[PDB]
Amino acid sequence: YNVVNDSSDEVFHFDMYEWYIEKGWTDRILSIDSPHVITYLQRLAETDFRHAELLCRFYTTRSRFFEAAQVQTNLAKSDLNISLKDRIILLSRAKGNASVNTIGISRQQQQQLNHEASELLEIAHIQDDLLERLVADPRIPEERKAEIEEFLDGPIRTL
């Protein structure tokens, strides 16, 4: 592992960040002082959920809660393939992270994000309560249930 960390090959270190993510070694990746890994995540954060989650962990441990709430909220409003329940977790985290002070950011900007995440989380829970009840309902034909699961187990719908 010395030979690994003693390298200056950049495509290599990118390939190793991806490999650590694959194997699940949050142990060793979260323990890198470097910003090089943060910058690498900032480009692909809004591309994949698993990468965004890593980026948000780096922000939170650095008391940058508002920036994580921003990543999580945009990810919940996006058209990436994300389940409704995963979008409930993202909003719930963003709601908490925007409710606490982050230095350098105005109280107004925090509250406006904590409010957008609170409303979207309220709608998401309604949608989850619906989807669950509809799937379990004995009086609903199977043919329709599959159709319900397609349109409700994804991005959050209007009221």
Partner: peptide
């Protein structure tokens, strides 16, 4: 923003196509 429209929906109790 909510807008009720009972007019044209999709029969929740009938399959598609």
């Amino acid at each position: 923003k909510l807008v009720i429209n009972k007019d044209m929906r999709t029969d929740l109790f009938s399959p598609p196509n």
